[PDB]
Structure formats: structure tokens, C-alpha cells
Paper text:
Non-ribosomal peptide synthetases are important enzymes for the assembly of complex peptide natural products. Within these multi-modular assembly lines, condensation domains perform the central function of chain assembly, typically by forming a peptide bond between two peptidyl carrier protein (PCP)-bound substrates. To address this, we report the structure and biochemical characterization of complexes of a PCP domain bearing a stable analog of the acyl acceptor complexed to the acceptor site of a C domain from the NRPS that biosynthesizes fuscachelin in the thermophile Thermobifida fusca. The C3 domain of the didomain resembles other members of its class, comprising a pseudo-dimer of CAT domains with bridge (R2923 to T2944) and floor loop (A2843 to L2858) regions.
To verify the role of the R2577 in controlling access to the catalytic channel, we generated the Arg to Gly mutant (R2577G) of the C3 domain. To control the modification state of the PCP2 domain, the mutant PCP2-C3 didomain construct was expressed in the entD mutant of E. coli. Similar to the wild-type construct, the protein expressed well and crystallized in the same conditions. The structure of the R2577G mutant is very similar to that of the wild-type protein, with the PCP2 domain sitting at the acceptor site of the C3 domain (RMSD (all atoms) 1.2 Å compared to wild type). The first noticeable difference is a small rotation of the PCP domain in relation to the C domain and slight alterations in the PCP interacting regions of the C domain, likely attributable to the R2577G mutation allowing the first helix of the C domain to sit deeper in the acceptor channel. The major difference, however, is the positioning of the PPant moiety, which now fully extends thought the acceptor channel into the active site in a similar way to that seen in the ObiF1, SrfA-C, and AB3403 structures. This observation supports the hypothesis that R2577 acts to control substrate access to the active site of the C domain. Firstly, we confirmed that the R2577G mutant C domain retained activity (with Gly), although this was reduced compared to the wild-type C domain (32%), possibly due to the loss of stabilizing interactions with the PPant arm. Whilst this residue is largely conserved in LCL domains, it is typically Gly or other small residues in DCL domains, which we have confirmed allows the unmodified PPant into the C-domain active site.
Numbering used by the authors: 2481 to 2552, 2557 to 2999
The structure:
Amino acid sequence: VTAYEEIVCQVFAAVLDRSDVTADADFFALGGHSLLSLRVVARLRALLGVDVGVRDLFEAPTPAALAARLTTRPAVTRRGPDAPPVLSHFQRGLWLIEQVYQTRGAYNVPLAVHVSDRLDLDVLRAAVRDLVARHEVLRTLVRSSDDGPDPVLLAPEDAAVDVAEVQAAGPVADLLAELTAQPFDLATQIPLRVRMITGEQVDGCVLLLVCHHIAADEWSFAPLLRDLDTAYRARAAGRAPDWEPLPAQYSDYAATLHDWLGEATDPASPLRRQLDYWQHALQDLPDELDLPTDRPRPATASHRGGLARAELPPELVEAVRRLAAQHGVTVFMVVQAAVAVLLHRLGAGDDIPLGSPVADRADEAVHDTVGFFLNTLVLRVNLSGNPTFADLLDRVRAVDLEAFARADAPFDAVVDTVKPPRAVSRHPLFQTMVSYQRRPSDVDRLFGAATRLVEVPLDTAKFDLEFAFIEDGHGGAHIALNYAADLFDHDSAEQLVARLRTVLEHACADPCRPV
Ligand SMILES: *P(=O)(O)OCC(C)(C)[C@@H](O)C(=O)NCCC(=O)NCCS
């Protein structure tokens, strides 16, 4: 759970009166001392509701280390040569949504970088090979058996990488979306595909990485670009990249997680314990919410979608951060509360279940590596009683901290335990997702050129609605709404995401007004 790390950063920043607090900055090196350590502990106890002590801060003086400590489950260890691949339960759920609900390429994740230079295709191909050699998860196939899916780790010399140039014919943003949507056959193809887009209207090139989600979450963007940059620069100079072996492969992480999780039939295992919480917490859940769609739910889901964006003025982004600090919540919690208000005002009622991904990256061996570490949680917020926005923030905090203490039970096991009525055109337990994302910083000079990330207007959709508050890595932010085209017209989606901005604006202006 990254939320613990954000709060520790937030408390460090307020106590130290510093705005340059990063997850690996040492409290005392930043100007902390015993007197201020009392304030850090008191604030953390007040915001997290757990027993925090000076001993924790002394022994774990960085936000990443302290967040891992307050949570902690065994550390991830390398299993060594010829340890067999292990498919994680999170990977299992992704393979399974796609097999069962036939999501086409909706779970492909794009990473697009405009480059001022056209890159060398043969050098790029060599660098992708190095990248795949480094990260086993990028060359692990998934094959169907009659027990479930089996991983198949390809040796680096047997991994056939797919790197190609594509001439742009029309608007590049549409082409990026179409390339992103092409489905993978994970039984025969590695889950990474690379395209360099060139054309008359393109100055330089657009480098597009398409991963299947089974191999990467959005926190993988930073190591992916970092390692690809290193391999490209080395191969352009005629040599193999000079890197240090990974502290762990994804299979090392998966093996540790599964051994800690235990079995569902063991009443003392963390899995059964967290499953029992979720069975209680999701009792009498709505099958779906009463959303203002342009069309009723079809019998068959097409997974077509669009993407509507709402730009946020810098002033509003700071007001949202200020509101979060002032009420002792994360930016995600504010956005979550705002989405709940929006849906509530549109007639969805007082019981609002919102899905949200949660990253399992606290362990230092995987904190900054490539892979899919997201579990999905149902955050059930209640809006009965005419609460103010400040009231709702307290409610959302409590709901989220309870859920975060129980974030290892795989979502597919939660759905199985809760046993909702199933329908191929409705995602179970929730149909609106909310997340916070933050794009990599210092990715403006990759490959020896001038570079910048470009967002991709997805042609697909996973749910009815997916809201994302996305920070761009250099101060800016926008809200992205990935909506199901079966339910919403694009102009309705533009209105919805503008309304979410209005809720946020009203909330910062006066949090004491009633929802
Ligand atoms: P933190 O580790 O920054 O704490 C500093 C301290 C309070 C431990 C230290 O500055 C301090 O005052 N230690 C006590 C010194 C002492 O007991 N001498 C008194 C002679 S009776």
C-alpha cells in the first residue's frame, strides 16, 4: 500500500517545513532531531490510528522504510538459479478477467515517449533484448492448462522480441490507441511489444511500449524507461549495458507472497482472515449503481471505450494537496470522496462501492522494479446523514485504512467469497474505479535526445467508469475518465469529468458545506 508512504511523506514535510521530501530521504539528514521526532510520531498515530513510536522512526528514518515498518510478513529473497517461475495470484486474476469476460486488448498498458530524434531500430531492438534479459517477467509466457494458467519462462536467447517501425498515416494519438489495443497471445508471445512511430507530421519519433498488464503496472514506467535508456545508450556505443543484478525477480516476489498468504482452508492463514473481513464488509452490496448513462447496460460487453480529460489549473492542484494535508488524508482519498459525491448527486444513493488498485511494493526488493503489483480493493463509502465534505474525508479515511490492512487477499478470491450474481457485461462488486497515478520524473532527456511522455486516448474500457487523478511528474495534473462506450457518449463523459473538477473546486473552497 503506497498510501502509508504518502502520509509519512506528508507528515515529514509538515513537521520539517520542507517541500522536497522523497521516499528515501532520511529524516535526520533533512533536519530532523529528537524534538521533531515527537511531532512525527504523534501525527502518524493520529492519522494512521496505529501504535507508532520513536523506535520506529529511529530504525526506519525514510518514508519508504517507515511505511514498510508500520505495516510489517517475510522479506522477499532471491531463490537462485533454475528456480521455476511462479505466477502470482494478481497475474492469475488478470489472465482470468481476460479469458472469462473476453476483454480484447483492454488490459494492455501503453507507455509512449515522444523523442526529438528518430531512434536507430537495430540499436533499439538490441536494447529491448537487454531489457527482457534483465526482467524475467517480460519473457514469461502464460499457458492454459486444465488446472489453471502455467508460467513458461523463456531463456533470453529464446525470447523473440517484437520491435518495429510504424509510419503514421493520420493523427498520431489515434494510432497510438489502435496499436495499444491489439491483443496479445500470451501462450506464444512475450507480454511486451515496442513500436517506433515515424511520419511526415512527426518530428523525430514516438516510442511506444505496449505491455500486457500481467507484466507491468503503472509504477513500472519509471524502471522501464530507466533500464531501456541505459541499454539503448550502451548498445549505441557498441556494448552491453553495465548494470547490477536485480535484488529480486517477479517470481521471487510471487513465491514469497504465496508462502505468506497460506491456504484458504487454514483458519489462521492471512488469506482466510482477510477473506473473512471482506465477506463481512461487502455484505448486501448493490449489484450495480444507478448511473446516468446514455444507454442501458447491454447483454454483451464490447469493451470499447473512450478517454475524456479534465485539465486542472496548478492553483487547484495545490488546493487539493493543501486540503489533503490539512485533513490528514492522501490526495487519492480526496479524489475518492469527490467521485462518491458526484455519483451520489447523480442519484446513485448513499452506498457507493468504488474499486481501486493498491500497490504491494513496500518491500525494498520490489519497490522500484518492473512487474504487476496491484491488487484491487472495494472501497465502500457511505454518504447517509447529509455529511459535509470534511465529514466525508474522515469517513473515507476510516474505510480506506480498514481496507488497506487487508489488501493481500487477491480480488478474484474476494469475488468468489462474496459470490455476487455474475453477468458478462457487468464487472462484479464495482463498476466505477478511482485511482491516483504519478508519472516518472526526469524523463526529459532519454536516449541522448529531448523526450516527453504522451498520454494515449484508449479505444477500450475495463469497467463502466474509471477515474484517474494523474500527476505528470513536473507539477501538473489532470483527471482522466476511461468510460464504457456502450453506456456513455463522449460528450457525456466530458461533462462528467468536468463535474468531478467542480466537486473538487467546491470542496477546496469550503469543506464545511454539506455534500
Ligand atoms: P535526539 O537523539 O536528538 O536527542 C538528544 C538528547 C535529548 C538525547 C540529548 O541532546 C540529551 O540531552 N541527552 C542527555 C544528556 C544528559 O543526560 N546529560 C545530563 C547530565 S545530568
